[PDB]
Amino acid sequence: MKAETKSYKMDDGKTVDIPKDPKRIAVVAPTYAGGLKKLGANIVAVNQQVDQSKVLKDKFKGVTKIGDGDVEKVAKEKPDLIIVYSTDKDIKKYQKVAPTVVVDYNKHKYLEQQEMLGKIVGKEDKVKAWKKDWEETTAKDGKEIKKAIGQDATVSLFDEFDKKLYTYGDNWGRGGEVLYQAFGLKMQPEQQKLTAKAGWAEVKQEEIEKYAGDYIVSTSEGKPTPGYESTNMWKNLKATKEGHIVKVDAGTYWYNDPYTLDFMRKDLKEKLIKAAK
């Protein structure tokens, strides 16, 4: 008894010994859940946050749910591999349980992230195939969306985060990966400048007009009207006056794994084409 292990160089430069073929993965960091599920990995524990997604909840039925810090619950599932963010405060505790892969979220753009998960579980060929399909499809989608909204149309992305107005770059979820990378739509220029270093930013809500483009995607679907959509400033944005607001489901759009990506691809394409009428 002794699963054969392979060396893996983590984001921090440290090498760790992980199973060549992991059988029981505890996915504490939920960014990585859908991508590992897509690759057929056996996940024995997953962060309860997946249950906020219209896409991922059904995909993890029967899988033990865990919240942040629950080392005991993770231990009980006897995992052979544990996935956490670099910002996780319980990393040493996880390490005493199973080889723990510590991912620095901002080190991987969304396609490289899925390639990274392919390396972890030894299924890079499956990633390649999926990626080629994704790119070809979203390339045609983006060309169609551009003809509908206009090649130079800018698109802003707004979200309420901890009771504050936030915006995002092209790889911090909220649909940004599909809007700005897969579709190739133009990001509103002040949004791009502000989010350029960090990938995300709080926006002073009285300055929202500064960051508002030809179209606005807001993660407010199914919610009461947020503070930032209720102002006279919001009412007088050209995008608002023109009927160019697209609303999306925040719990679902937070993610950027292959299942979520296919959903946001369809949903945004539909909403963007409608908003352009």
């Binding site: 960014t31 963010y85 910002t87 979220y105 901002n106 985060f161 911090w172 960090a198």
Partner: peptide, 6 residues
């Protein structure tokens, strides 16, 4: 990331 979860 710093100042938030990731």
């Amino acid at each position: 990331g710093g100042g938030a979860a990731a």
